[PDB]
PDB file of C-alpha atoms and ligand atoms in Angstrom:
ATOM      1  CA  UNK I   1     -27.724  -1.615 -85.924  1.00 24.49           C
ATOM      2  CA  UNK I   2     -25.011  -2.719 -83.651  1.00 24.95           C
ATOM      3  CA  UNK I   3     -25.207  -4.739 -80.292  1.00 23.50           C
ATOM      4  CA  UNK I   4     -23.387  -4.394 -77.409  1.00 19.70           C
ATOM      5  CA  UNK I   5     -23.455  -6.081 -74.277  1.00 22.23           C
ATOM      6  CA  UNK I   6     -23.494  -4.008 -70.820  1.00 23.59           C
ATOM      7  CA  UNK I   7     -20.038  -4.031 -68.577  1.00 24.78           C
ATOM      8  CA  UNK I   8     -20.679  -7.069 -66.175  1.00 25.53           C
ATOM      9  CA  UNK I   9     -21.691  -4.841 -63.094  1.00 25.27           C
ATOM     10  CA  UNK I  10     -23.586  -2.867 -64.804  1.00 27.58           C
ATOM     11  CA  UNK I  11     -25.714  -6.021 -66.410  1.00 29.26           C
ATOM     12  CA  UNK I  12     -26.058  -6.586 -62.732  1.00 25.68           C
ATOM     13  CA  UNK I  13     -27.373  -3.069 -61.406  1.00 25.42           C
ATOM     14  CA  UNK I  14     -30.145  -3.120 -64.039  1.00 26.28           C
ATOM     15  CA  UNK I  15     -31.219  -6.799 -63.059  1.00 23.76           C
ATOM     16  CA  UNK I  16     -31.684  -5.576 -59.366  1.00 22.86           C
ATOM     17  CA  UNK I  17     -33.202  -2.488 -60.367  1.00 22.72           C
ATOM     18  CA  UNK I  18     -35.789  -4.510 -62.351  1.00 19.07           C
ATOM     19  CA  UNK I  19     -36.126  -7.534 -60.061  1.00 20.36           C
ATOM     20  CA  UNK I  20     -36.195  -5.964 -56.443  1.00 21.87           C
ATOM     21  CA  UNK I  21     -39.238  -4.724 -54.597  1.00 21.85           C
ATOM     22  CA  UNK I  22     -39.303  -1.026 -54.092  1.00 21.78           C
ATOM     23  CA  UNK I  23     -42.055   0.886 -53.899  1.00 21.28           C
ATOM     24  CA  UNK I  24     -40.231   4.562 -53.968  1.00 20.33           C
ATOM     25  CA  UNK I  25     -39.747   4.757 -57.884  1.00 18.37           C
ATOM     26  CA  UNK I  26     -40.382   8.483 -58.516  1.00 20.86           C
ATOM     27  CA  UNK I  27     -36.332   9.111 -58.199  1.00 19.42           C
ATOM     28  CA  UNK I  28     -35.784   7.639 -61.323  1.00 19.05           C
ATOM     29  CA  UNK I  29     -37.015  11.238 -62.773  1.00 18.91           C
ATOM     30  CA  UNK I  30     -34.932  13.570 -60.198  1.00 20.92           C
ATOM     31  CA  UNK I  31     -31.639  11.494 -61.485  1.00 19.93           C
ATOM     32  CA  UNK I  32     -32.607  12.380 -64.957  1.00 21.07           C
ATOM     33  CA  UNK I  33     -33.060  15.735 -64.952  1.00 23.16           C
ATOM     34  CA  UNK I  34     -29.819  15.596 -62.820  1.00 24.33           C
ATOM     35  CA  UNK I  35     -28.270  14.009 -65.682  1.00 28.59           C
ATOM     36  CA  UNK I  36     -29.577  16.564 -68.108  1.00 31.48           C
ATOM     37  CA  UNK I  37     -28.098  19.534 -65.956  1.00 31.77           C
ATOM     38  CA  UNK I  38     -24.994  17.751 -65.983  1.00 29.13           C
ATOM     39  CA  UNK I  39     -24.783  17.961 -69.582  1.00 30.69           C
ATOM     40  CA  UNK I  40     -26.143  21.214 -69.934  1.00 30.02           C
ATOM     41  CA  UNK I  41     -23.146  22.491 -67.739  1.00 29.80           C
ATOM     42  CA  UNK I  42     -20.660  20.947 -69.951  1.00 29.47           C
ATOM     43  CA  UNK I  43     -22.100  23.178 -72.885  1.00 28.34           C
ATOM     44  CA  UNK I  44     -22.550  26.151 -70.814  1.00 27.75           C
ATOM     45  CA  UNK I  45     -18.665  25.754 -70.249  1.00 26.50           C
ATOM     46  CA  UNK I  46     -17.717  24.930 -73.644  1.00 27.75           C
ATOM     47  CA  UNK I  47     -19.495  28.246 -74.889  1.00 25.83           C
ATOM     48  CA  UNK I  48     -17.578  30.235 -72.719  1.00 26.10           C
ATOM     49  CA  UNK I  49     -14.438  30.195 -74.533  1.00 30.71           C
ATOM     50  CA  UNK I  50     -15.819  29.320 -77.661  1.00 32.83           C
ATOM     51  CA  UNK I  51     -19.277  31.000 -78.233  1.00 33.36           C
ATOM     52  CA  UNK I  52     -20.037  28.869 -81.503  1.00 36.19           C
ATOM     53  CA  UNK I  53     -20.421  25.766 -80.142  1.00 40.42           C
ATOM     54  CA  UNK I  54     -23.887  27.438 -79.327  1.00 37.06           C
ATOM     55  CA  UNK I  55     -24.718  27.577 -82.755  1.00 38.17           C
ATOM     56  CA  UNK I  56     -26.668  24.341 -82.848  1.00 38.62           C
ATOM     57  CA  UNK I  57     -28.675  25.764 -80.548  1.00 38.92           C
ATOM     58  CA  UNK I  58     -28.292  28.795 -77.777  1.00 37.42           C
ATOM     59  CA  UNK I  59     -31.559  27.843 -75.716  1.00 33.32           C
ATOM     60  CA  UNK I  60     -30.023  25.571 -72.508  1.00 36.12           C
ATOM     61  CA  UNK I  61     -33.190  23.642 -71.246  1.00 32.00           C
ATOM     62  CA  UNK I  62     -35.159  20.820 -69.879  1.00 32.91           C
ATOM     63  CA  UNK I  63     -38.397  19.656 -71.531  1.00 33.28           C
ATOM     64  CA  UNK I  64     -40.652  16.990 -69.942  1.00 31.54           C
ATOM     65  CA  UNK I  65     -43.063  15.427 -72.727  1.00 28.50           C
ATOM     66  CA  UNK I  66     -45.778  12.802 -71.316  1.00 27.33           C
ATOM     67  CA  UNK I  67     -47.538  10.870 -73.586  1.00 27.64           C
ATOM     68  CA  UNK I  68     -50.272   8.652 -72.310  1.00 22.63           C
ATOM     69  CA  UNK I  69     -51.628   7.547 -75.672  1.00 22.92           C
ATOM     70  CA  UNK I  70     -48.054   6.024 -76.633  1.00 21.13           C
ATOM     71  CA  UNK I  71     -47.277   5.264 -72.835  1.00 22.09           C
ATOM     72  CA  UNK I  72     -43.948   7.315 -72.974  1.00 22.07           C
ATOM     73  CA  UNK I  73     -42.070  10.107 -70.845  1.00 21.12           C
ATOM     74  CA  UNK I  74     -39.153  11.842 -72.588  1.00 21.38           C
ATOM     75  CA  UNK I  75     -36.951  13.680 -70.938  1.00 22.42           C
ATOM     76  CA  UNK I  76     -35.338  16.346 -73.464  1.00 20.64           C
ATOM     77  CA  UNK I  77     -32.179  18.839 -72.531  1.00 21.20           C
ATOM     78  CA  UNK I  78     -30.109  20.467 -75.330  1.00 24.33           C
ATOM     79  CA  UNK I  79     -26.882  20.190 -73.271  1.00 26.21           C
ATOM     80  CA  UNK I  80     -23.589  19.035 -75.174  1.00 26.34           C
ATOM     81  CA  UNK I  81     -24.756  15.253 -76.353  1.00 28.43           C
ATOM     82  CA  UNK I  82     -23.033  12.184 -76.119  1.00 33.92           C
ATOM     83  CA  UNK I  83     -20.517  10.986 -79.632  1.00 33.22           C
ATOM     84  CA  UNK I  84     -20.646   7.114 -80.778  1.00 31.10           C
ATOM     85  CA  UNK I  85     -17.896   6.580 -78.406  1.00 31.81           C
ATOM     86  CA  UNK I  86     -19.868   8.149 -75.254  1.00 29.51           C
ATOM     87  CA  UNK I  87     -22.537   5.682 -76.077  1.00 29.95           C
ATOM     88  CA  UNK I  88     -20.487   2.712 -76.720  1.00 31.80           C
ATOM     89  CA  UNK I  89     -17.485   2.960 -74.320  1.00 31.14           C
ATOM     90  CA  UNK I  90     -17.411   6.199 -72.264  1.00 28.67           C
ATOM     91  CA  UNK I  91     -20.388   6.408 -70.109  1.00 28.68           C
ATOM     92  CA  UNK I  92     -20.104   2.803 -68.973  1.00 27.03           C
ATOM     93  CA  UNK I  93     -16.644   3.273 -68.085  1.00 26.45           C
ATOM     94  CA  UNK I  94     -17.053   6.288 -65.794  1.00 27.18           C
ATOM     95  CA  UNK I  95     -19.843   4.237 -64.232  1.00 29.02           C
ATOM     96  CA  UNK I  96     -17.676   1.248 -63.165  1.00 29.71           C
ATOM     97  CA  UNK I  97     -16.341   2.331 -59.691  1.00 30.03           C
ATOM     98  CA  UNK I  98     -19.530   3.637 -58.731  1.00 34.21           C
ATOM     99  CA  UNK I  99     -21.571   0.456 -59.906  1.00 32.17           C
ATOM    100  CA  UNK I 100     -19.165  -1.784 -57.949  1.00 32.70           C
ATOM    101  CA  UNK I 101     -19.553   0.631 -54.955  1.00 31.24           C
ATOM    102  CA  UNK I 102     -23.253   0.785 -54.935  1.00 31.32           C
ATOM    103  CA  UNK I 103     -23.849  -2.722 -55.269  1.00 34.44           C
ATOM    104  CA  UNK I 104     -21.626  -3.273 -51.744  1.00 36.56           C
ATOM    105  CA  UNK I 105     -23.982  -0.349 -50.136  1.00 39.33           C
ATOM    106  CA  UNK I 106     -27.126  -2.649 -51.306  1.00 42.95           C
ATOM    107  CA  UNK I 107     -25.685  -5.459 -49.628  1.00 42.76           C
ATOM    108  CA  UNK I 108     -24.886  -3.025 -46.795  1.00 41.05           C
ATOM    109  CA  UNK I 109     -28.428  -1.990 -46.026  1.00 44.44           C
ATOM    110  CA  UNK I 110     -28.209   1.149 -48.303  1.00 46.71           C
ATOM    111  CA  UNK I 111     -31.723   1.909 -50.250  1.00 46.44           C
ATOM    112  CA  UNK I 112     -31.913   2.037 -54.039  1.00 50.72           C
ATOM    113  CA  UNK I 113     -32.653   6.102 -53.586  1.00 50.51           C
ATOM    114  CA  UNK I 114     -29.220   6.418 -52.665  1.00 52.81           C
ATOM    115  CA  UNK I 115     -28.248   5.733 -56.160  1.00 51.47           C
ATOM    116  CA  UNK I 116     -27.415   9.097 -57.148  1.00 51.75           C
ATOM    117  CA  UNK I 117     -25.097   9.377 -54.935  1.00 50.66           C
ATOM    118  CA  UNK I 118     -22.692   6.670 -56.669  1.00 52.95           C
ATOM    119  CA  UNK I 119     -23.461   8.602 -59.762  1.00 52.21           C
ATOM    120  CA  UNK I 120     -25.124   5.399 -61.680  1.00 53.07           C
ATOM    121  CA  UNK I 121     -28.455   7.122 -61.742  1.00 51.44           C
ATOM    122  CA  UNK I 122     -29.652   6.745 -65.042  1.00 53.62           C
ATOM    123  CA  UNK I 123     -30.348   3.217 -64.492  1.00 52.73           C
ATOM    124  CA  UNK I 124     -33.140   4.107 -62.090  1.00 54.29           C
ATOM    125  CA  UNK I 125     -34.897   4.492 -65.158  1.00 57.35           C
ATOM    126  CA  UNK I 126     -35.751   0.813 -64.619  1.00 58.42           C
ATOM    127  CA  UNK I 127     -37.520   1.179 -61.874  1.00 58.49           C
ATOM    128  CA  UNK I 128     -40.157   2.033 -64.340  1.00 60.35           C
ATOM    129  CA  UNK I 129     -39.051   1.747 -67.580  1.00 57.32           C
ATOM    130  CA  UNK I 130     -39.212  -1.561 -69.732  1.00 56.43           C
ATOM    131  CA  UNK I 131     -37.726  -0.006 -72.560  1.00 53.88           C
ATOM    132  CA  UNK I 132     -35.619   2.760 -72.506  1.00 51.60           C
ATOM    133  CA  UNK I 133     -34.573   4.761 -76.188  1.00 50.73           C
ATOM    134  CA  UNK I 134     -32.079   7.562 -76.439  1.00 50.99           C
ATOM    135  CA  UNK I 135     -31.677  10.215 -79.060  1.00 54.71           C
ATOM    136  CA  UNK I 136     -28.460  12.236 -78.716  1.00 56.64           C
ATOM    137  CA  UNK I 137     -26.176  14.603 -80.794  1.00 57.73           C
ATOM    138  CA  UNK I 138     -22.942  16.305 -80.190  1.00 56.59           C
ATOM    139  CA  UNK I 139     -21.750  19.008 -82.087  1.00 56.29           C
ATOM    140  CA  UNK I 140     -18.798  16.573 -83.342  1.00 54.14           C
ATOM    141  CA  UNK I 141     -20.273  13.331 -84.614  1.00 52.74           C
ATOM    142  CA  UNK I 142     -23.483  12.376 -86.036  1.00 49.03           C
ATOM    143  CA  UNK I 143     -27.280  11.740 -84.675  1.00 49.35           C
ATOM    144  CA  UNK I 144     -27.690   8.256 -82.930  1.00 47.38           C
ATOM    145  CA  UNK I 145     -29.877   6.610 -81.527  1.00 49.86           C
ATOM    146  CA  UNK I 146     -29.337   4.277 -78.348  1.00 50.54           C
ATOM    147  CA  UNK I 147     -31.523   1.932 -77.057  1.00 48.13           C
ATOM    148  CA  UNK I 148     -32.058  -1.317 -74.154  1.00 49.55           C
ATOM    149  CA  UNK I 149     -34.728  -3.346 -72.559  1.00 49.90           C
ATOM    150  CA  UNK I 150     -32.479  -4.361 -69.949  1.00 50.65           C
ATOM    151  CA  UNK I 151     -31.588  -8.212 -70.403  1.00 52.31           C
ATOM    152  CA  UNK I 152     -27.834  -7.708 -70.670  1.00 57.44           C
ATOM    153  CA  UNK I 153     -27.421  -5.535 -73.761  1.00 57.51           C
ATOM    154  CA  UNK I 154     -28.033  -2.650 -75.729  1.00 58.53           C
ATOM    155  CA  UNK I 155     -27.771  -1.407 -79.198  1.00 57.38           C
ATOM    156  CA  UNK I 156     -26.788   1.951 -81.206  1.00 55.59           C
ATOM    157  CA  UNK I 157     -27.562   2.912 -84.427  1.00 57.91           C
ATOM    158  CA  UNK I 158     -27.288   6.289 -86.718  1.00 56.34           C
ATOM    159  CA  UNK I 159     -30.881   8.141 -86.504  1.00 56.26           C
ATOM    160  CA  UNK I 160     -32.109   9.200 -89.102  1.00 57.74           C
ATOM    161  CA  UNK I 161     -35.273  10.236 -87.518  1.00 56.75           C
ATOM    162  CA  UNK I 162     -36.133  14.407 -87.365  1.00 56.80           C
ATOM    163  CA  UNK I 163     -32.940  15.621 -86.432  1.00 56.69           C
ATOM    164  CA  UNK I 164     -32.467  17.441 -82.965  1.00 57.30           C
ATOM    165  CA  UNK I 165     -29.765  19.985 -83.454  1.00 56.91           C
ATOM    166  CA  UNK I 166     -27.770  19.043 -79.930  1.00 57.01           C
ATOM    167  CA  UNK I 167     -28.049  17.218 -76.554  1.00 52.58           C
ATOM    168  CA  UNK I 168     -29.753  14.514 -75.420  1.00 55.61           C
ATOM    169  CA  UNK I 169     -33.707  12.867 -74.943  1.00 54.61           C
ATOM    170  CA  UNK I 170     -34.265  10.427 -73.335  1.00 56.73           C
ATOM    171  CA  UNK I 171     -37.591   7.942 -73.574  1.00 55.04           C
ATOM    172  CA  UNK I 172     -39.191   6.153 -71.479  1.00 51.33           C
ATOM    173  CA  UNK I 173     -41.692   3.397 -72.684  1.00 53.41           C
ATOM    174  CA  UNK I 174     -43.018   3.080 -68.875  1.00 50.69           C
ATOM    175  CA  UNK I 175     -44.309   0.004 -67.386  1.00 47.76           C
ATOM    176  CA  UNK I 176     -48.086  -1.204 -67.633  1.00 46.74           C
ATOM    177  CA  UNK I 177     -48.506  -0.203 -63.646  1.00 48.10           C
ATOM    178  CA  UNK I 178     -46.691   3.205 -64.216  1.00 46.61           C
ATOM    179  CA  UNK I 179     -48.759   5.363 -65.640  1.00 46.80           C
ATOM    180  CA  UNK I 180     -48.692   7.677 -62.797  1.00 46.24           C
ATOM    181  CA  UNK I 181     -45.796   9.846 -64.318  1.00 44.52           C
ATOM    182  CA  UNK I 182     -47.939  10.452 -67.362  1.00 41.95           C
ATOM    183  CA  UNK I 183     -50.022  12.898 -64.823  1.00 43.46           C
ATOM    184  CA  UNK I 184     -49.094  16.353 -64.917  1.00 40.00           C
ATOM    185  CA  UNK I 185     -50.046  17.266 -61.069  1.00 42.04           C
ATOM    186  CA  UNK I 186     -47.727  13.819 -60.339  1.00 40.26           C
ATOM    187  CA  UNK I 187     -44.946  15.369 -62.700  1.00 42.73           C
ATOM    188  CA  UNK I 188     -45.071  19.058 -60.770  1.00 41.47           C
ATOM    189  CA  UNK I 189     -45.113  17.245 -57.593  1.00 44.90           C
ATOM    190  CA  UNK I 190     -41.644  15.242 -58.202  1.00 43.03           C
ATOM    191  CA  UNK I 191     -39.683  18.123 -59.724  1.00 44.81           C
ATOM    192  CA  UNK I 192     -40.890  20.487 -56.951  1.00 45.49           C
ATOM    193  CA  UNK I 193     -39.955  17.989 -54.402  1.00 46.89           C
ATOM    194  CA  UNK I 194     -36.447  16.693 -55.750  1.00 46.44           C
ATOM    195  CA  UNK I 195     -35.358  19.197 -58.583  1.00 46.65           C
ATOM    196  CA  UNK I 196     -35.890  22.727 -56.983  1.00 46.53           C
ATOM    197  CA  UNK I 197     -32.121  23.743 -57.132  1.00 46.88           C
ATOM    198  CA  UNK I 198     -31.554  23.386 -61.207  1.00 46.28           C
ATOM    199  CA  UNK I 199     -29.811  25.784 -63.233  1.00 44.26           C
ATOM    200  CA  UNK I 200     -31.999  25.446 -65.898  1.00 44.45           C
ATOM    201  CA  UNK I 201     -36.152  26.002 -67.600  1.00 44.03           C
ATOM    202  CA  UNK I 202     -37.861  22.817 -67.142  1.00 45.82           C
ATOM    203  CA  UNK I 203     -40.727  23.055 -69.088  1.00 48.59           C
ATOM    204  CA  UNK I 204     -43.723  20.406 -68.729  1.00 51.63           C
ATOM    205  CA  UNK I 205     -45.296  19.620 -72.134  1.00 48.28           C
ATOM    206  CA  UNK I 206     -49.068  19.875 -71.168  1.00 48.78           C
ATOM    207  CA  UNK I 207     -51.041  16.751 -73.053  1.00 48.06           C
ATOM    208  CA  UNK I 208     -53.752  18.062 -75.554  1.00 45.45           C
TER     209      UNK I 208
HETATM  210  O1  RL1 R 301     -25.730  13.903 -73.146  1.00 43.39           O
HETATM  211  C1  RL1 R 301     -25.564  13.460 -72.005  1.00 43.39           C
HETATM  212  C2  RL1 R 301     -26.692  12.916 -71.173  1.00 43.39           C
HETATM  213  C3  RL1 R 301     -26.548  11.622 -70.681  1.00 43.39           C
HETATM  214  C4  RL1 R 301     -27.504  10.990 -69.908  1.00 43.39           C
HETATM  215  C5  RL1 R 301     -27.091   9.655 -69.392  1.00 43.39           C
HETATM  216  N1  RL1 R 301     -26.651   9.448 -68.163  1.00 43.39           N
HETATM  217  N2  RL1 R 301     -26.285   8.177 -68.016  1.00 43.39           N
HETATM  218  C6  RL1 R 301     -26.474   7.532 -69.198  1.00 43.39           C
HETATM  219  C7  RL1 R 301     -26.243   6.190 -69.568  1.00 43.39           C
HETATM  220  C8  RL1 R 301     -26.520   5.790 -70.873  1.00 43.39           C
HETATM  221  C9  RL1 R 301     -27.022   6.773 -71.747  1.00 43.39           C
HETATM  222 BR1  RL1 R 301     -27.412   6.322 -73.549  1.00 43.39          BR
HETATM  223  C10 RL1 R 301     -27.238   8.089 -71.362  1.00 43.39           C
HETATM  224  N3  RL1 R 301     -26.965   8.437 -70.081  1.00 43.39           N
HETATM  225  C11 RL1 R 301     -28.677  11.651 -69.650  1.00 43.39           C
HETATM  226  O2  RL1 R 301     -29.647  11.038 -68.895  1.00 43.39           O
HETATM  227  C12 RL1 R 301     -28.870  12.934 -70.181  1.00 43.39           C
HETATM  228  C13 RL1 R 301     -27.877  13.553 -70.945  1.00 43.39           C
HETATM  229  O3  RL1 R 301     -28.032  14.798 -71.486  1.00 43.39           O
HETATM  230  N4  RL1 R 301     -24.243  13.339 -71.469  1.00 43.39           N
HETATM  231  C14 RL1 R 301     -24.058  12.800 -70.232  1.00 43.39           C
HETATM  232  C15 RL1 R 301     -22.847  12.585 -69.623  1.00 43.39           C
HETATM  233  C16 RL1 R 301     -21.716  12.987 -70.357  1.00 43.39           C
HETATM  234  C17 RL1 R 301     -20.424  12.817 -69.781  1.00 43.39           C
HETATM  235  C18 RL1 R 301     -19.310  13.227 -70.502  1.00 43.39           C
HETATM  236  C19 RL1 R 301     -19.471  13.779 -71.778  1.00 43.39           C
HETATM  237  C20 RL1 R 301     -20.743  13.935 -72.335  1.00 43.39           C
HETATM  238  C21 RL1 R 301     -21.886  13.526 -71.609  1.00 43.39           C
HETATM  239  C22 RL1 R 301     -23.178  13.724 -72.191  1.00 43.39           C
END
């Protein structure tokens, strides 16, 4: 297990995220599943010129998974994954400009909604998230899994937990006070309301 600590602004976003009142946190799931169309796309494109980069899986989907008795939401897609260097290095660094930027629109009078906008997103997962774990695997490199509770750093490790053939899921270990995005109807209500337009199945994993 390696540690890492966040790029300075990005140390920053999360604190606000976790530390500022805001009552509005359904977004955080809208800029996931934005996040996993994103990636989605980027396979879809791969396989058009080169059809066996499919072969770790053809299905291109979104699965959301509550689970109330563990207190987590995952977020699955099979789009093309993220290598140790994505994790590490890449995803922060196409973040930068648009953490710096957002940050100024906060002290601006812009609302944390607009987050999406500035492409930073993912960290919205704070909102009601204490933990967040992430499970991803590219066709290039191996399984790993990623993981932060916020407080300035994260860490990355090889998984060798059941292996996922490609793409990306995402946990959430919610927040004591959040288990309203365990609920199905509250689930179907969000995606109908912010993720209409999505190239993409997403499925709802109905609790048994
Ligand atoms: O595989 C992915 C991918 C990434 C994120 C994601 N978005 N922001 C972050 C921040 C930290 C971590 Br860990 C994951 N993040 C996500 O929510 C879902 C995904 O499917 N991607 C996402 C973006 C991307 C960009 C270039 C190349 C590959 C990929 C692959």
């Amino acid at each position: 297990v390696e540690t890492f600590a966040f790029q300075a602004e990005i140390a920053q976003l999360m604190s606000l995220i976790i530390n500022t009142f805001y009552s509005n946190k359904e977004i955080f799931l809208r800029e996931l599943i934005s996040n996993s169309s994103d990636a989605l796309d980027k396979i879809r494109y791969e396989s058009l010129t080169d059809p066996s980069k499919l072969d770790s899986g053809k299905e291109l989907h979104i699965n959301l998974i509550p689970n109330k008795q563990d207190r987590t939401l995952t977020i699955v897609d099979t789009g093309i994954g993220m290598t140790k260097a994505d994790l590490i290095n890449n995803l922060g660094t196409i973040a930068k400009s648009g953490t710096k930027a957002f940050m100024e629109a906060l002290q601006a009078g812009a609302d944390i909604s607009m987050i999406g906008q500035f492409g930073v997103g993912f960290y919205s997962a704070y909102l009601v998230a204490e933990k967040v774990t992430v499970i991803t695997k590219h066709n290039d490199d191996e399984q790993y899994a990623w993981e932060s509770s916020a407080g300035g750093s994260f860490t990355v490790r090889t998984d060798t937990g059941e292996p996922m053939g490609r793409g990306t899921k995402v946990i959430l270990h919610l927040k004591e006070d959040q288990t309203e995005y365990l609920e199905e109807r509250r689930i179907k209500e969000i995606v109908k309301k912010h993720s209409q337009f999505i190239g993409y199945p997403i499925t709802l994993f109905v609790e048994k």
